[model samples]
Target: FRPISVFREANEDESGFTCCAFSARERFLMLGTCTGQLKLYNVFSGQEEASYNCHNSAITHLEPSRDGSLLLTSATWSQPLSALWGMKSVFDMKHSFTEDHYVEFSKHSQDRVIGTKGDIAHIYDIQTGNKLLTLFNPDLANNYKRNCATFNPTDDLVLNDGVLWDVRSALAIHKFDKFNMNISGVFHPNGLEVIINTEIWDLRTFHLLHTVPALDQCRVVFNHTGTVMYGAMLQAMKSPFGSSFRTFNATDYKPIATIDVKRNIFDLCTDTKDCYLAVIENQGSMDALNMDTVCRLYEV
Candidate 1:
């Protein structure tokens, strides 16, 4: 299969597009600009629905709530924020605190338990904005830090840098020491396994399940259902090449198809429904001052 453009355009900021996300209902598409503006568009209509002045600096992260009722944005600014919109206007600026650094919501819970950063994972209560529990750091001697932390699909467990911990008991269930690599991983939507360093492992047994290799210039992401997985890499080791983003079937962990793009991919956002992919590409020249940027979506 090939990736057809769902929406393609050159954004206002010559600096670049920082981040992009799709709503949970797949109705709205949001793009974070380097100029500190949040651009919103209707996915089906392909029209600019609204734009908001969000942060003082570039928005490094843009995320929507599970039900698409709220949007969270963060940057280098003093106040990173969350806004409540009823698919329209919003007057409530609900809550603002320090948990904005790479924060994520629990899958099975209603934004109740939040996973945050600081070389350690701190769990929080969403309504009260209180730190409920803290996960111990086993690598303080090595000065190891987590790149990402996620709640399992069943919402009973949390994975931070290869260590799977129980949410209920607040105890370490299992930790992997197979690779020396820093963990940038997530749980499958089915809640049976976790993927790290392109390798899939059984959650319950902690055994090797499957592997996908594309370490050069790509990212690995699974669809919401865990049925489809994707990654991008160079088409060839030689010159005159393009980037190949490949998709896989999770059942046998085999290649489904390769989506080719002749530009450098900086970021990718899988749609909430798991039906499409939004790509942020660095186009034109090699340097940041000269290279033009573009954001487009594809049907996988």
Candidate 2:
């Protein structure tokens, strides 16, 4: 249990880290700050390789592509915006898309993006800027929030508003009247189920398969092989990473293990081989007006 890298930087003294994501290739670390600064680092050397100012607001989301060729970022503001960046250099401005509301969307393995606009959800090709699919809601009231959107493992379907819409059919095959503002929704690796927060919902019948107390702040994810599911037990007054995170069997939804990682965790990720888990912790207080962050890799 040795630290591979540790480093920090001083910007405006008022600036602080907000989010970070590791490249899929595992060679680079992308860090975002409250002042809308983007910093890239070489993981093995713990060195800052590149930096850029991508937005005017604090970055709330960072996603690296599956092939590590590009990155997606979001700055949460009154009107949040998403940007696509090239990994070669900090100046390779690829594209930027503005959202109507402050929300986080998904960037799929095929280089496509999914987001919501009022009552309708839309899909676009990141490289072409072409709107490929526009998901229509059953009703046009536009009252419910569909802020968080995700694509299934195959990218054939989208999960939002507690409705699973098939891209091909452009129709809702499943709906959940009880589904509310979940922190996130993820599909099983096998593409047979989806987990909303601490509960498991089936994909075939759209039925509630299991339920657990919501402690993770709507953040839950499946392992690489879809054999394990991890959920954080978040304590509001404690650290951002939460009290600790626990694992469960993806197949049977049984308890597996837990780790007491106390930090304001911004993100959780597992390696391709599922050999390690990465936790990005961002801490600070508004009163003192300082930000401290650390990235910890644990053997799973």
Candidate 3:
């Protein structure tokens, strides 16, 4: 494994990148920074293509549409809002959560979006910004709030907190009891398994399939084909360098390789062809002027 390119923001003062994603076709690499700026860089040429001021505060998420026609952005500080962009701003709507907000375009439909704030999960029509569904755990009281939510690949089921809900009936189907306070839940491309934190669960039977051993509370992502799994080790003790990246075989959940990154990895993404892996890392202090965020591209 070797780094193909190392990308950094042009402006040194506002270079703390918070999130990143690859375009649907994997032609462009998109990055979101603490300065509320969105930057697009050409993947092959390793040159910046364009930049946009899409949010007022730091951007927390950047999700490209399945068809590569639109980009979704979200921010959760000072000015909390989510916007859909098609060259120009398409729709901008404010959300309530100022912390740990999650938003993403539906895997199967480009027009629908699922977002979570506090304890509530909402589905909205991207074009009209109209609310389509509001999902919350009726069994839990106000004290118990969900931090993340997402749609299954089929779009019929919604995973909020730990419960799976049927979108059409608006009823809870099953709960993955092990899921709690995890950063996010990712469904396999085949939609047969889900990884919440480090535990992999069988979606069909809601049974605990396997737990990735020794993984810290970090974000995990799968390659485009779902044959390989990658996770960022956020804990310091797992590696001598204080942080590292690990890959696994998706079929048996066996360890494949481990690379010491020597930095705090905030996000991980794989290209459409599964030929490359990208990691966003923090390099310096949180102070805007001293901080520098770097995006490293590695050949898989």
Per-residue lDDT for 145-184 in model 2, tens only? 4246678878888876656788889888766554444354
Q: Which pairs in model 3 have colliding backbones?
A: none
Which segments of candidate 3 are over 4 A away from where they belong?
25-27, 44-46, 88-100, 138-146, 234-242, 285-289
TM of each candidate vs. truth: 0.81, 0.82, 0.86
lDDT of 3 at 72: 73
**lDDT, candidates in the order shown:** 0.63, 0.65, 0.71
lDDT of 3 at 266: 63
lDDT (Cα, tens digit) per residue for candidate 1, span 1-300: 334554433344453556678866566678776566677766555566667767676666676777667666665454553322234357244555454456666777666545455446777676676778887666521222335667887777987666777989988887765453444567777778777666788976889887666532334667777788777553331111244567778677777887667776645777867777877666654534643546667776
Candidate 1 vs 2: which has more TM-score: 2
Segments in model 1 whose C-alpha atoms lie over 4 Å from true places: 1-3, 6-15, 25-27, 44-46, 76-88, 97-100, 139-146, 178-180, 215-218, 232-244, 284-286
Poorly placed runs, candidate 2 (over 4 Å): 1-15, 78-80, 89-91, 100-109, 117-120, 138-146, 214-216, 233-243
* Number of the candidate with higher lDDT, 2 or 3: 3
| Consecutive 10-residue window with the lowest summed lDDT within model 3 | 234-243
Error of 2 at 59 (Å): 1.1
After the best TM-score superposition of candidate 3, give how far the Cα of residue 98 lies from its true spot, in angstroms. 9.3
| lDDT of predicted model 3 | 0.71
